[PDB]
Every structure is written in structure tokens, then in C-alpha cells.
Ligand binder design. Structure first.
Ligand SMILES: [Zn+2]
Lengths: 1042, 231, 368
DNA sequence: TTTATCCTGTTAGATGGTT
DNA sequence: ACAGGATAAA
């Protein structure tokens, strides 16, 4: 029943376009100047949108932005003359969301992450003193504005703490609001508890209430009744400085039991009085009151691109209104038109900053369709309005019993981000208030009603019901089998009779995410290794020829149709034209449909985004049939790895501690080979001496290194570039003909491949070049990488490894039919890591190879039998043995093990080993780095860090401690001075090494001198001294800086 | 005992009552008397090549030293009160540029110099309110201060005016042609070479800080020097 | 065998700061005072003459090359030019020479003002709040009780109280003579100059003998600070700054990528701008409130330079992030000590993935 | 010659912050 | 912000 997987990103932009921008335009529409003579009205319900310029593909290839222009009709009304100059004003450029849920910013694909925050409303908490009683406090939190904290003291006093200032009894706040004693006495249910506070703090009247409120809020100024009134109005009553939100109003009404309208979004007297009454009742234990949990998913909200955009637009609109008022009052003449009145710079700047430089808009993860899909379904607890890494602690990063079916309990990062970034579950969705829901089937008298439609439900809703998991087994029609059924009641796990079950989850995979739903035999794995496998499935690399798994899980065809790289025919007809770049299908009786395929493009992670056709010319095609496929799909469905022959046994030390031994067939059969495209850039700037020229007249170079340039100084498409090869030839006008200097762009060390695209952008051609540049040349270089020693290989069950040896196929162990293996894995890593599912898939994959079949096993498949996975695997293996005719395929004494021989000697190993077909993936990432001498830092004169600039390795203080414990003094002193920042000892050491002499003694490193200068610059007279040798002499200050 | 400094300055300001027009006229007359006396003293300074003593200065006005000194005092106090009671006007004008490169407190202190100059050049005989003449000087002082103290690489005032005219011409061409003007079109309209326009665009940039997150920018910039290898 | 034996740190006197920054020229002119808040010229990309990157103060931008271009090449070594007076030498001296800034009004070093032990407060035997109010121009202090009866030495006076005292002192029948009040860091400097360390030490010792409890502990702390000042032979008024040092320009580099600038340039520019404006206000006899507000601004600017955000609000940059002041450089995990002195990035180093070599010996490794 | 850079003045009235 | 005037540096 899986709906659109990337719908949290669409619904929020469809909402922004439909009723999100309108509400923010109308909320600021009536602009009036101070004299009250001119008024600008923004008829924001009629904002039209101009069609996007360029195109999606043109924007991508030009390195531009995919956006539209917003025009709102306005009317400037003169309060007296009455002349109304109606017009349409330009408001801004809005980047548009593509059909896949992403945005195209500066020619790069970006995605707006979803933020899990605390929902607006009122939250109660009870705190216990070291020796005192329980004291209760309440926090009122709006969508945007100031917080309102209430607190109960140990003596029975009620205090209010506006913002973070000092407390003030609630009587001041209630009287300042304009409430007499009778109304606040009647609304409260237990009035003597507040009467104690009234008596202790004295009954304030409205005038003195406002006086004291002003005095406490803004000390040092003379109190003024009007001053206080205005302070309160600006703090909690100003529609443009305090917003509860629709969700805030909903939560306030739901919690406090009020009935206020949904349109009012500011605090009202009723609200504060109710909140106080609830606090009093919670203090007195009335019965219908309860403290709040802040980690509950019923008290937490999700914000997506629509809300975050709305907020940025609001800020820009506030700035725009300030500019409009400034450029409206100054004018002494009504010669202004609405076009000349509005300035779209603040709004454009706000939108640009949000989409380019915010920490909620993120560079897309595009290694494969799975990473892309799970990047759009990601929920973050960090950002402008959430948490910070140093403030998030143990409680926040854990699993809350309310995450069941809404947030995956497996898929998270490892390290500082563990528990702070999560993934939406498979069936979960976000409603229009911002709370995550999840679907259930109704159960009537123990019968599951799959005829009726799924009932979605939020975390707070499903607390009074008894909800059964999706792995419960029902008989014909719908009745639940068994006598005891596990259920969840009030965030607890219990068991009940199946006549008292209220709801049942829709699927057994309703609790996990999409990446974790792609792991077969998941219930036989540990959760840590399941996390590892799910995370590593999103680092797999699209291969040269992808291949479907044999033991897939059933969600592969659905995890690939949302990335928008598979083409399916919407029409039940015939195919008339097939090409490497074009497909055409003629409807049985109708129009022709034509599709264009992307070819060897480049993703954010330098992988390849190819697209290939599947069908042939003159082929009968049905609707919904796969027509083209992506770089990580075979025929409809995800394909991230390959199926290879695997044996579980140790080699001669090459399997040691997660190392991997593979065969040479994986190299010459083009298994686990991939295409990676990199981008290099060169800039022609304008120096004070003169401009920079791209030409082949490069100094100090021979014609043997200008073979592949295009008589303009730029390499040619289709040329093979090795390391250090010139890509674009550039000359700079240095100041000291023989005057040009060479800073042409060359391939970095360790890079090679073919040149596939050389795009040029110059201001003449109508391109948006940087401020000081006069030519931007971009070169794309592609290469094919094979599996090799040092690469990371992985499986779906969390088993990672680094390849340490590649054996010729006559050295690898072979089967009783002569087939050498493809990979040998150490079994020592299986039982200590509890990822037994890898031993099931292999075996089933073995059967799948032998029976020319493909198995779709769904996780948690043991609801049908006592041991369903083992029985299915054994039955499949026996069936394969009977169909093939070879008895060595399957043995009854050792089911999963068969005899294997040694390729080096021809002798069989002592005992049979487990062999099968395993689905392994090749992970991304270019890490090898070395340095002798290179660039140095500006202040400290220490080597730079980074592979791209010949950087050094850091010798931290733990390494200094390690060298101190060894007793090493000369290695340490050489590391600290001669090899880092002894500005004069570096050259002497290098010269001594080159000449062959001895390295001289070092001096004082430059960082110490920098520190002494900084300390002197802090008004400290710190200095270095040389002690006097004889008696009647003074110590002499030593000059280091010489 | 607040920690805010601007609020403390606003409180110190509020302890002063606004002047009335007759008070302005009286103070303007005393200010003019003080100015004339100062001019005379300056004349004595040119004649003596030294600061005149109070006795020599009093002698230059044929005035008893006591009368002269008291007149001088009255004039000083008059100018002091004229500036003091208008600091509120200075704040009211200075609040309109709080996001241009100078902090709010810097805008206030720079507009105070303009207010002092305005109080030094106000003419009661003109028959105008001091709040009209002083506004020009306050605005001029603040604008000049922004032009001369807002950037690390300071640009001359003529460059700011050139950039403003370039923006206005670009907006006018965009309105006229209904599209974003090209570089050549703008250069022709401005009657200046395209290289000059690019130079203006390059010099208008704000310097990026070394500590911009990338991790900071300052850790990715090499150092000027001769590589140990090249020696 | 070693160049230096021990590192000694003491309280910097204004004479020492001037010595650090003042260097004489063959023409007889002394240089080392930064007078203009100008870093570099926008068109020539050449440092100004009396700014934060001056070549006459810090050193030539290009080694063996004059600012005006009169002298070039090594041949002219130690030849200070005449047209602009720049020393034709190596540019490396731009990271060793300091220069100074002379302040129109004295300021307080925030380290000795806002610390866990407040040395200014401890020496003056005053609460920290009173000292802060005096420094930041929120209250007056009675530098001399004079002849008044209800006024005590080192007593805080509000503005209204000081106005009442003014009315009393300007009454035709007042016998009141010799009363003095002060506001700002100048008052703190006068109070610090008043302290006679020997007599204070003797009095505190005598009082400590006849004391116990928390009173004894507080007098012990005062005596310890006073005895430290006596031993160091340093005058406590040196905690109030009259001149400040300028860090060498290469330690606050202004490189061109756009121009990337250190936050120290902006902090120094704020200090110089406020100091110059204060000098102008003191030259035209501005109203007292304007001058006092400018002095408060100068104090805040020096505070933000020494340690940003310690006392008042935090000075943000172009983006809403704190500017990195002098104190932020030498502290924290990213500070100088832990990032560049106790651990460094070294040359002749590499990094790579590790695989298992089973045929290697225990004393061998496989290197690509 | 021709700009690049600095200096001075401006008359309706206006008079305490945002985030 | 904008206009006029003085000057020196390119
Ligand atoms: Zn010179």
C-alpha cells in the first residue's frame, strides 16, 4: 500500500505555492506611512508566476538556477486625492521544485531537509528539590515570539518570567491584561491556591500592575501605565511579533480544553488563565491533568521547505516594508508609483541566502537512487530553531516509544550525529499540522478489516488503543489467529486476547525506513549491523553493468521509481524508435510519446547518471512497463551491487580482521567497475598588471605537451589526460615578450581519464560570470575504475571489508565442478557480529542461481511458520539439487556446506565450507596522500592540511605524549621544529638531505614567536631571558625575533 | 544598573528637556556673540603668534576682565545647551542608517559632530526652526562618516557616488527595456569604458573574513615565500 | 649552549609598550604610532602611510624595495628612503615590529577588571559593580573628600547627587573647599596612584593579626596582591592603559584571494576611529555628555579588542558571528597553544588505508 | 590634459532601538 | 545625496 515515497517534499511546496505565500503577502499587505496619506495594498491572492527561463536541463548544464518570477498586483491609494495607480510589481525570483522533489541552485541539485522541532503549545513539568517537595512549572511556546514561563514556588506562590528576566507574581500579569478579580476568580477552579499568592504579593490594580511590569521589564526608566500597556501589546499581543500558529492554537485548545477560534493566533486572557488553572490543578492532583513529555512525537513537529521558506519570505517582507515606508514618507510629492515604491532586494537576498547558504538546504546526496531517496525523507533535529551538537545529550538521541512506525529505529549516522538525524519510516506521512502519522487497519471482534480504508493515526492518538504489530498472522478472510497477541498500550508492550485489539499495523516493514527495508532476512541480524548495512547501502556506487539481487526483498522496484531515473510507458502500444539517446512509443490508437535519455552526466558525488533503454524497435509495450533504466537499476528495480560466488573460510591470512580476498574475474569481467566524472575549473581574471589570457603560448613548455589543445589553449573533447597534463593553458602578466607567467590548469597527481565536456562561459556569450572574472572554463574528465587493493566492499547485512589481495583464478578455491570462487570471506566475523542473515541470503542466492529464479523474501517472514527462513532455504536448495541433477549442490549432512578444493595444490580442504551467491556493493571514495614539502599557513608558517593542496598530517598532542612515553627526544624535536615551522631550519634540513650532510641543530619555531607577539599585544610584558654568569651582572633579555 | 550602553545613552539624553523656539533664538544670539569673540581672539593669535592671555583678550574687547569672562562663559553654555537639547534629533536621524557599515553608537557620535556644526552656523535672523537646518548637517555628517569609516578598504566618496549612479542607470535601463541590461549597454549609457565598469564592480566588493566556515577560510590560504624546494 | 634560560612575564608599563613600538629614523623622526584607521589603498593595493599596515612603521611590503619605488634591489641595504622614509630591508620584519596606538583618554584592561579575581577591585577594596560603574561612566567617585561632612573617600555619587553637591559647592556661603570627583578610567588611575603599597601592607598585616573568619581571608587576598605588587616593583596604575600595542600586520594578514581580512583589523579600526573622534571632541570643547559617551565607546572598543564579549555585548561581523579578538586566539582547543604549539602538522608525512600483509615480518610494513 | 581625491555647504518640520 | 570649488597625481 506504499504511497509516493517522496511526498513530504512535494506537499510542502504545493502548500507553499497554494496558500503559504498568499498568507504572508496578505499579512503585510496594508502598508501605511506615518502621515497616513498613502497606502500600498498588495492583492496577494492574485500573484501570478512567470514561466521559468532557460530549462531544467539548461539550468543544470549552464550552472544556473531553476526559478520563476513572482508578480503581485498592487494598488497605491492616496488617502485624500484618491488617485489609485494600479500596477503589477516584481516581488522576487522563486526557485522551483522539480518533479523529483529537489531544487536546482547555481547548477547544483539541492534538497531542503525536514526539521523535527518542538511543537508550539503549553508544556507542564514537575521538578523535585534536593530536600523540598515537587514544584510545577509551565512553558508556553509559540510558533514565533516570546515564551511565557509560569512557575510554582515551594510556599505555594505563582510566578511569571517573561523572556529570561527575573520572575514576577502572576497577579501583576493578570491585572495588566485588563481583568477584574471576579473573572479570574470564577475561571479558576481552585481559587484559594491563587488567593494565597494574592495575599502574599498584594492585589495589584491595573495601573500599578502596568507600572510594576514596566519597572521589572525595563529597569532604570520612569514607569508609565501607557509604557507598560505598549510593552505587553508588543510582547504577546502584536500580530507581527507573536504568532502561535495554527498548530499552536490547535495544541493550546487541545491541552487547555478551550474553544477559541482557529483564526486567532495570539495569546488571549482566556489562554493564560486556563494555563494557570491547569498548573494549579496539576499541583493539587485534580485527576485530568498530567505533565508533558517533550520527546513524544505528539509534542514534536516537522517543518519542510514550505514553512522554512515562508519564514524567510516573512523576514524579507519585513525588510521590504521598512524600505517602502522609508521611501514613502521622505517623498514630499505624490509622484510615486507602485513600481518605483517596492524594492525586491531584501526578499531576493533572503530567498538566495536560504537556498544557497543555509544549513537546512543541503547539497544533494546522489551516489545512487537509494541515497537520493533517503535524502528527501530525512528528519533533522539541528538547525536554526532546533538543537546544537554540544547541547544535545543522551535523552534526545535515543528511541522514544512514540517513534513506532514514524521514525526508523535503525537508520542513523554513526559518530557525533548519532540519534540527531533520522529517517521517515516506510508508511509514515506528515499531516497538515506537522505531526507524523502512520496507518492501521481496524479490528472488529478479532477480524482485520482490510476492506475498509487504512486509518492513519498520530502518536498521541494511538495511546489509549491496543495496537498490534504488522507481523500478526490472520486466517482466511481476516480473523486473527492465536490466543495471545502482542499489543502496544500507552507506550508499553503487553499481550492480550485477540478480541480486545483495536488496530493492526499495515505491514511488517512499517517500523523501518526504505534503506532498512531492502535488507533480506533482516530479523536474523543484529541492530548495529543492520544500521551498518542500511547506511552502507547508500554509499554503493553504480556499476558498469548493474544486476538485480537474487534474494531481493520486494521494495526494490519501488525504491527506484521515485528517484525519477526509470522511464515507464504510460501507454499500451508499440515502440517505434529506439536509440541510445531517444525512445519513442506510438499508442495503439493515438499520439506518439517521445523520451530523451540522460547520457554520462555527473552527480554531486562524481558518480555517473547514465540512462539506457531496455526495449527494442517494434516491440509490444504495455502501460506501466519499464522502458529505460538508471545507473543503479536493472529492469525497473534498484541494483546497487552484483551477485558473486562467495565462500566462508579463512585464507592464508588475507581474510584477517574484515579484510577481503577476491578473484581476478572481478577485474577482467568488469564486475565492480564504475564510471566517475570529475570537474576542473579555470578562471581568467583581471590583475592590476593586466588581464589573463587563455592561449597555447605557454612559457617553458615544448610542443610535445601541447598536442591535445584546440588552437585556443583548451584541451579537446575525447583526449586522454594523464597526471600533470595541461587542460587549459593560461598566462598571467607578471611584473618584473618574456613577461607572461604560466598558471595553466593541469590534472592533479593521481588522476587520469578521458575529456568528455569542455564548457566555456564568457560575459560576451550572455553568461553570469563572477564579479572580477573574464572567462570561466569547465572541463569534465571521466574514468573507469576497477576493483583493486584498498577499495571497500560491503553487503546488505552490515559486513564491510577492504580488499587486500586479488588472486588469479587458478589460485582461488574451486567447486566440485571446476568453478573458482569470486570472493572468500572470513567466518570469524559472522558469529561475533551477529549478522546471520548474510548466511541465509548466500544460501538462497545459491539456489537462485541454480534454479534460474529470483526470490522476493520480505523481512520478518516467520509469522507463517516456526522457522520459515531456514525451511524455505532448505526446500529451495533441495529443489535446485533435484532440478539440476548434481548431488554435490546440496548435502543432507551439512545443508549449507559443500566440498571445496585448493587451487594451488588441488587437495580438498578438511571440511566442507559454506558457499553461495552473495550480493555485494562497492562503496564510494582518492584517500591516498603524501607530502614532503609544500605550502604553508600564513600566521604560523606550518604546513597546510588537505589532500587538494599537498597537505601534511597532523601530529596532535596524543602523538606527542606517545613519543614522550617512548623516551624519544630527537624524533620529537625534529617533528616539532624542523619539519613544521622552524622557518630557517626547514631549508637547512632539506639542503643537508639533498647534499648528504648532517642536519644542523634547530632554532625557535615560528609559532612560539607568534604567541609571544600576541601576548605582548595583549599588554603583557612577557619576555625570554638569559641568566647572568658572574655575580655582579644583570640578566639579559634575549631577542628571539632576530 | 543595566549593562546596555545605548540604553544608558538614551537615558542620559532623556534627562534634558527640549528647547522652545524663543529659547533657540536666545541661544543663537549668544552663540553668535561667542563666535564673534572667538574670531577676534583668532585675530589676536595671528598678531601674537601665541595664544592671547585672558587679560590681553579682554583688552582687545575694551571690556573688564570679569564682564568679558562671564560673557564668554554664557556663550559656551549657550552652545552647550543648544547641542545638548538636540541630541534627541541626532538619534532620530541616526536611527535610519543602522545597517550600513557603522554601528548605531557610531552613527550617533558622528551625527553629534554635524549637530555641533549646525549649532555653529545657525542664523536666527533667517527665521527658521533649528530642527530644519540641523537635519541637513546631521545627515551630511552621518553620510560622510559612512563613506569614510564603513569599509576596511576605504573607498572615496566619488566612488560611492559612481556606484549609486551605476545602480540608478541600471534600474532605469531595466525598466525601459523590460529586461536586465548588458554590460555594454550600461557602459554606453554611463559613457564610460567597460573596463572602468568592471573595475568599479571589483572595487565595490566587501572583504570576506578569514574565519568563514568552509573549518575556516584562513586555513586554506598558502603563504607568500620561497618554497624550501625552490631555494 | 642555549639562547635563553627562563621566560618571565610582568605587567606592561606604558613606557614598555612605547618602547616595543617606537623606533627612530636616521632623519631624527620617531615612528611607531598608528594614527589612521586605513589598511590599504583600493586602487594601488598598497598600504597607507600612517595606518594599520604602514610600511614606515611595520616594514616594507616587498623585501629590498621602497614604498615610493626610489630604492630597489639588494644593493640598497639599510638605506632608509628620503621621499617616504621606509627602510629598504626584508619584508619579514613585518611580522616582528609592533607599533602602538596612543589613547586620548585612559582605558581599563578588561582582564584586570572582569576576572574571577578582580585585581583592580581587590587592590581598591571596592566591589566589582562599583568599579564597573565608574569605568563605564555610570557614577562618579569622590577622589578627595575635601571639606564636606557626608562625603567619604572612594564613594559613588549618582548624577543627581553630584548635581546637589555642585549646588552646595557653588553656594555663596559655602566653606566647602578641596572636594574632587572623577568618572571613567581616569578616576581609577587616580585611585590606583593613591595607593601606598608599603603602608597598605603594614596596615593589612596588623589587621590580619587581629582578625579571623571570612574577614581574615579577604584581607589575606588583599595582602597577597599588595605584596606581589611590592615584590614585582610594578605600579598598580599600569592596569589602566594609556597606550596599547599593535600586533604586526603579518599576524593579522590581509590577503587577496576578494580580500580576506583578520578580525583584528576591524577591532583596531574601531579603536582608532573612536580615539580620533574623541580627540576631535576634546579639541572643539564638545558638550560633556558627548565626550563622556565617546570615552565609554573607546573603553568598549578596547575591551572588544582585548577580549570580545567578556564585559559587554559581543561585536559581530558581517555575518552574525563573534569577531575573534586577541584573547580568543590563545585559548580553547582551537587556540594557539593546543593547535600550533602542543601539536603541529608536519612535513614528510602521508596517510592511506591499511590492508593486512600476512607474509610481512613483525618489524616490516608494506608501503605503496 | 584629464581625471582622482578632498573640502565645504543644504533652510517647511522633524527630536529615545530591534532583535 | 547633491552641487560647487581647489588641486595634485596620473
Ligand atoms: Zn621611498
Amino acid at each position: 500500500h506504499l504511497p509516493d515515497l517522496v511526498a513530504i517534499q512535494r506537499n510542502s511546496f504545493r502548500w507553499f505555492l497554494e496558500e503559504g505565500l498568499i498568507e504572508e503577502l496578505e499579512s503585510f499587505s496594508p502598508i501605511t506611512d506615518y502621515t497616513g496619506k498613502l497606502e500600498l495594498h498588495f492583492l496577494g491572492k492574485q500573484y501570478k508566476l512567470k514561466r521559468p527561463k532557460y530549462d531544467v536541463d539548461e539550468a543544470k548544464r549552464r550552472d544556473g538556477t531553476y526559478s520563476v518570477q513572482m508578480y503581485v498586483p498592487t494598488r497605491l491609494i492616496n488617502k485624500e486625492t484618491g488617485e489609485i495607480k494600479e500596477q503589477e510589481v516584481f516581488i522576487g525570483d522563486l526557485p522551483l521544485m522539480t518533479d523529483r522533489g529537489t531544487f536546482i541552485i547555481n547548477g547544483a541539485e539541492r534538497v531542503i531537509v525536514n526539521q523535527i522541532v518542538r511543537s508550539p503549545g503549553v508544556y507542564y513539568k514537575s521538578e523535585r528539590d534536593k530536600n523540598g517537595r515537587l514544584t510545577h512549572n509551565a512553558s508556553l511556546i509559540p510558533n514565533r515570539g516570546a515564551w511565557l514561563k509560569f512557575e510554582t514556588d515551594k510556599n505555594g506562590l505563582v510566578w511569571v518570567r517573561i523572556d529570561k528576566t527575573r520572575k514576577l507574581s502572576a497577579q501583576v500579569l493578570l491585572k495588566a491584561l485588563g481583568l477584574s478579580d471576579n473573572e479570574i476568580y470564577d475561571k479558576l477552579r481552585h481559587p484559594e491556591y491563587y488567593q494565597k499568592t494574592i495575599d502574599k504579593e498584594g492585589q495589584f490594580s491595573e495601573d500599578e500592575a502596568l507600572m510594576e511590569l514596566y519597572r521589572k521589564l525595563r529597569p532604570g526608566e520612569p514607569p508609565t501605565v501607557s509604557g507598560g500597556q505598549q510593552l505587553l501589546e508588543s510582547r504577546f499581543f502584536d500580530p507581527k511579533r507573536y504568532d502561535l500558529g495554527r498548530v499552536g492554537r490547535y495544541k493550546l485548545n487541545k491541552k487547555l480544553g478551550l474553544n477559541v477560534a482557529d483564526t486567532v493566533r495570539t495569546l488571549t486572557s482566556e489562554d493564560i488563565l486556563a494555563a494557570i488553572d491547569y498548573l494549579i490543578n496539576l499541583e493539587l492532583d485534580l485527576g485530568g491533568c498530567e505533565v508533558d513529555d517533550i520527546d513524544h512525537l505528539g509534542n514534536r513537529r516537522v517543518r519542510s521547505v514550505g514553512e522554512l521558506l515562508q519564514n524567510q519570505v516573512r523576514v524579507g517582507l519585513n525588510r521590504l516594508e521598512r524600505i517602502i515606508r522609508e521611501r514613502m514618507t521622505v517623498s514630499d510629492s505624490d509622484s510615486l508609483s507602485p513600481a518605483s515604491l517596492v524594492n525586491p532586494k531584501p526578499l531576493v537576498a533572503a530567498i538566495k541566502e536560504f537556498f544557497g547558504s543555509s544549513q537546512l538546504s543541503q547539497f544533494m546526496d546522489q551516489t545512487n537512487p537509494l541515497a537520493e531517496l533517503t535524502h528527501k525523507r530525512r528528519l533533522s533535529a539541528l538547525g536554526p530553531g532546533g538543537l546544537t551538537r554540544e547541547r544535545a545529550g543522551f535523552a534526545v538521541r535515543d528511541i522514544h516509544p512514540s517513534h513506532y512506525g514514524r521514525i526508523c529505529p535503525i537508520e542513523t549516522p554513526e559518530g557525533p550525529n548519532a540519534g540527531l538525524i533520522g529517517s521517515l519510516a516506510t508508511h509514515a506521512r506528515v499531516n497538515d499540522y506537522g505531526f507524523i502519522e502512520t496507518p492501521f487497519w481496524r479490528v472488529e471482534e478479532g477480524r482485520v478489516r482490510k476492506d475498509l480504508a487504512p486509518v492513519y493515526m498520530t502518536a498521541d492518538q494511538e495511546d489509549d488503543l491496543r495496537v498490534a504489530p504488522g507481523d500478526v498472522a490472520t486466517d482466511d478472510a481476516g480473523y486473527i489467529l492465536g490466543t495471545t497477541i502482542p499489543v502496544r498500550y500507552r507506550q508499553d508492550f503487553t499481550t492480550t486476547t485477540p478480541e480486545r485489539v483495536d488496530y493492526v499495523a499495515l505491514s511488517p516493514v512499517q517500523i523501518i525506513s526504505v534503506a532498512t527495508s531492502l535488507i533480506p532476512f533482516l530479523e536474523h541480524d543484529d541492530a548495529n549491523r543492520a544500521l551498518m548495512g542500511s547506511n552502507m547501502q547508500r554509499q554503493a556506487v553504480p556499476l558498469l553493468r548493474p544486476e538485480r539481487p537474487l534474494v531481493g526483498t520486494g521494495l526494490e522496484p519501488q525504491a527506484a521509481r521515485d528517484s525519477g531515473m526509470v522511464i515507464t510507458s504510460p501507454v499500451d502500444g508499440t515502440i517505434s524508435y529506439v536509440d541510445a539517446t531517444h525512445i519513442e512509443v506510438t499508442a495503439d490508437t493515438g499520439e506518439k510519446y517521445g523520451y530523451a535519455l540522460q547520457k554520462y552526466q555527473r552527480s554531486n558525488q562524481d558518480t555517473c547518471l547514465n540512462q539506457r533503454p531496455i526495449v527494442f524497435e517494434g516491440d509490444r509495450v504495455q502501460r506501466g512497463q519499464v522502458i529505460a533504466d538508471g545507473s543503479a537499476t536493472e529492469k525497473g528495480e534498484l541494483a546497487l551491487g552484483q551477485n558473486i560466488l562467495v565462500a566462508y573460510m579463512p585464507w592464508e591470512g588475507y581474510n584477517y580482521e574484515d579484510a577481503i580476498l577476491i578473484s581476478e574475474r572481478l577485474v577482467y569481467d568488469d564486475v565492480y567497475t564504475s564510471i566517475h566524472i570529475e570537474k576542473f575549473e579555470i578562471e581568467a581574471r583581471q590583475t592590476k598588471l593586466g588581464p589573463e589570457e587563455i592561449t597555447r603560448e605557454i612559457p617553458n613548455v615544448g610542443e610535445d605537451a601541447l598536442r591535445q589543445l584546440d588552437e585556443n589553449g583548451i584541451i579537446r573533447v575525447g583526449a586522454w589526460v594523464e597526471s600533470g597534463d595541461i587542460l587549459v593553458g593560461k598566462v598571467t602578466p607578471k611584473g618584473e615578450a618574456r613577461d607572461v607567467r604560466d598558471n595553466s590548469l593541469r590534472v592533479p597527481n593521481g588522476e587520469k581519464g578521458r575529456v568528455v565536456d569542455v564548457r566555456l562561459f564568457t560575459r560576451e556569450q550572455g553568461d553570469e560570470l563572477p564579479p572580477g572574472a573574464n572567462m570561466v572554463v569547465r572541463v569534465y574528465v571521466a574514468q573507469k575504475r576497477k576493483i583493486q587493493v584498498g577499495d571497500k566492499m560491503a553487503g546488505r547485512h552490515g559486513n564491510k571489508g577492504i580488499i587486500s589481495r586479488i588472486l588469479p583464478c587458478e589460485d582461488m578455491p574451486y567447486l566440485p565442478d571446476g568453478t573458482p570462487l569470486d570472493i572468500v570471506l572470513n567466518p570469524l566475523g559472522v558469529p561475533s557480529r551477529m549478522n546471520v542473515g548474510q548466511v541465509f541470503e548466500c544460501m538462497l542466492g545459491w539456489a537462485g542461481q541454480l534454479l534460474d529464479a529470483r526470490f522476493k523474501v520480505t523481512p520478518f517472514d516467520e509469522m507463517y511458520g516456526a522457522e520459515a527462513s531456514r525451511l524455505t532455504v532448505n526446500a529451495k536448495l533441495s529443489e535446485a539439487r533435484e532440478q539440476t541433477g548434481q548431488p554435490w549442490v546440496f548435502s543432507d549432512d551439512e545443508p549449507g556446506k559443500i566440498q571445496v578444493y585448493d587451487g594451488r595444490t588441488g587437495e580438498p580442504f578438511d571440511r566442507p565450507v559454506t558457499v553461495g551467491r552473495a550480493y555485494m556493493l562497492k562503496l564510494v571514495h582518492d584517500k591516498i596522500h603524501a607530502r614532503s614539502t609544500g605550502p604553508y599557513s600564513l600566521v604560523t608558517q606550518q604546513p597546510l592540511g588537505g589532500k587538494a593542496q599537498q597537505g601534511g598530517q597532523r601530529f596532535g598532542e596524543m602523538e606527542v605524549w606517545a613519543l614522550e612515553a617512548y623516551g624519544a627526544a630527537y624524533i620529537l624535536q625534529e617533528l616539532l621544529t624542523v619539519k613544521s615551522d622552524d622557518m630557517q631550519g626547514r631549508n637547512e634540513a632539506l639542503n643537508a638531505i639533498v647534499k648528504g650532510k648532517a642536519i644542523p641543530r634547530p632554532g625557535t619555531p615560528e609559532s612560539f614567536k607568534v604567541l609571544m607577539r600576541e601576548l605582548q599585544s595583549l599588554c603583557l610584558d612577557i619576555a625570554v631571558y638569559k641568566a647572568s654568569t658572574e655575580d655582579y651582572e644583570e640578566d639579559k633579555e634575549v631577542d628571539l625575533m632576530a | 544598573y543595566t549593562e546596555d550602553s545605548i540604553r544608558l545613552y538614551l537615558q542620559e539624553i532623556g534627562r534634558i528637556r527640549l528647547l522652545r523656539a524663543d529659547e533657540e533664538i536666545e541661544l543663537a544670539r549668544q552663540i553668535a556673540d561667542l563666535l564673534a569673540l572667538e574670531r577676534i581672539r583668532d585675530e589676536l593669535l595671528e598678531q601674537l603668534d601665541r595664544l592671547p592671555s585672558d587679560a590681553e583678550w579682554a583688552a582687545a574687547v575694551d571690556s573688564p576682565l570679569d564682564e568679558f569672562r562671564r560673557r564668554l562663559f554664557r556663550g559656551r553654555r549657550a552652545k552647550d545647551k543648544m547641542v545638548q537639547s538636540n541630541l534627541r534629533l541626532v538619534v532620530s536621524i541616526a536611527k535610519k542608517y543602522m545597517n550600513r557599515g557603522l554601528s548605531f553608537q557610531d552613527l550617533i557620535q558622528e551625527g553629534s559632530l554635524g549637530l555641533i556644526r549646525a549649532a555653529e552656523k545657525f542664523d536666527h535672523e533667517k527665521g527658521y526652526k533649528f530642527s530644519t537646518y540641523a537635519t541637513w548637517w546631521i545627515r551630511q555628517a552621518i553620510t560622510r562618516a559612512i563613506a569614510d569609516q564603513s569599509r576596511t578598504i576605504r573607498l572615496p566618496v566619488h566612488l560611492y557616488e559612481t556606484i549609486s549612479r551605476i545602480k540608478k542607470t541600471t534600474k532605469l535601463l531595466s525598466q525601459e527595456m523590460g529586461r536586465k541590461p548588458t554590460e555594454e549597454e550600461i557602459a554606453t549609457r554611463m559613457e564610460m569604458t567597460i573596463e572602468k565598469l568592471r573595475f568599479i564592480a571589483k572595487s565595490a566588493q566587501l572583504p570576506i573574513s578569514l574565519e568563514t566556515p568552509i573549518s575556516r577560510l584562513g586555513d586554506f590560504i598558502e603563504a607568500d615565500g620561497e618554497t624550501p624546494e625552490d631555494e | 649552549e642555549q639562547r635563553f634560560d627562563y621566560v618571565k612575564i610582568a605587567l606592561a608599563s606604558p613606557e614598555r609598550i612605547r618602547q616595543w613600538g617606537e623606533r627612530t629614523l636616521p632623519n631624527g623622526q620617531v615612528v611607531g604610532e598608528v594614527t589612521k584607521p586605513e589598511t590599504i589603498n583600493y586602487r594601488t593595493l598598497k598600504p597607507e602611510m600612517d595606518g594599520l599596515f604602514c610600511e614606515k612603521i611595520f616594514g616594507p611590503a616587498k623585501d629590498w624595495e621602497c614604498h615610493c619605488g626610489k630604492y630597489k634591489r639588494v644593493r640598497h641595504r639599510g638605506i632608509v628612503c628620503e621621499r617616504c622614509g621606509v627602510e629598504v630591508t626584508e619584508s619579514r620584519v613585518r611580522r616582528h615590529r609592533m607599533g602602538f596606538i596612543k589613547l586620548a583618554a585612559p582605558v581599563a584592561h578588561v582582564w584586570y577588571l572582569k576576572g574571577i579575581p578582580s585585581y583592580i577591585a581587590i587592590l581598591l577594596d571596592m566591589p566589582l559593580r562599583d568599579v564597573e560603574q565608574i569605568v563605564y561612566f555610570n557614577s562618579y567617585v569622590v577622589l578627595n573628600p575635601g571639606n564636606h561632612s557626608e562625603l567619604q573617600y572612594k564613594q559613588l555619587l549618582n548624577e543627581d547627587q553630584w548635581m546637589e553637591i555642585e549646588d552646595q559647592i557653588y553656594a555663596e556661603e559655602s566653606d566647602l573647599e578641596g572636594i574632587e570627583v572623577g568618572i571613567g578610567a581616569e578616576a581609577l588611575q587616580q585611585l590606583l596612584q593613591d595607593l601606598n603599597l608599603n603602608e597598605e601592607s603594614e596596615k593589612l598585616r596588623q589587621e590580619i593579626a587581629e582578625s579571623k573568619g571570612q574577614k581574615r581571608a579577604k584581607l589575606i587576598k588583599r595582602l597577597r596582591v599588595i605584596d606581589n605588587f611590592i615584590g614585582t616593583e610594578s605600579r598598580p596604575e599600569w592596569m589602566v592603559l594609556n597606550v596599547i600595542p599593535v600586533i604586526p600586520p603579518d599576524l593579522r594578514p590581509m590577503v587577496q584571494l576578494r580580500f580576506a581580512t583578520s578580525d583584528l583589523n576591524d577591532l583596531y579600526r574601531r579603536v582608532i576611529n573612536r580615539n580620533n573622534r574623541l580627540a576631535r571632541l576634546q579639541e572643539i570643547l564638545a558638550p560633556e555628555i558627548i565626550v563622556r559617551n565617546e570615552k565609554r565607546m573607546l573603553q568598549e572598543a578596547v575591551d572588544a579588542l582585548i577580549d570580545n564579549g567578556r564585559r559587554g555585548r559581543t561585536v559581530v561581523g558581517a555575518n552574525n558571528r563573534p569577531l575573534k579578538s586577541l584573547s580568543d586566539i590563545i585559548e580553547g582547543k582551537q587556540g594557539r597553544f593546543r593547535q600550533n604549539l602542543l601539536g603541529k602538522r608536519v612535513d614528510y608525512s602521508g596517510r592511506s588505508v591499511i590492508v593486512v600483509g600476512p607474509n610481512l615480518k613483525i618489524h616490516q610494513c608494506g608501503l605503496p
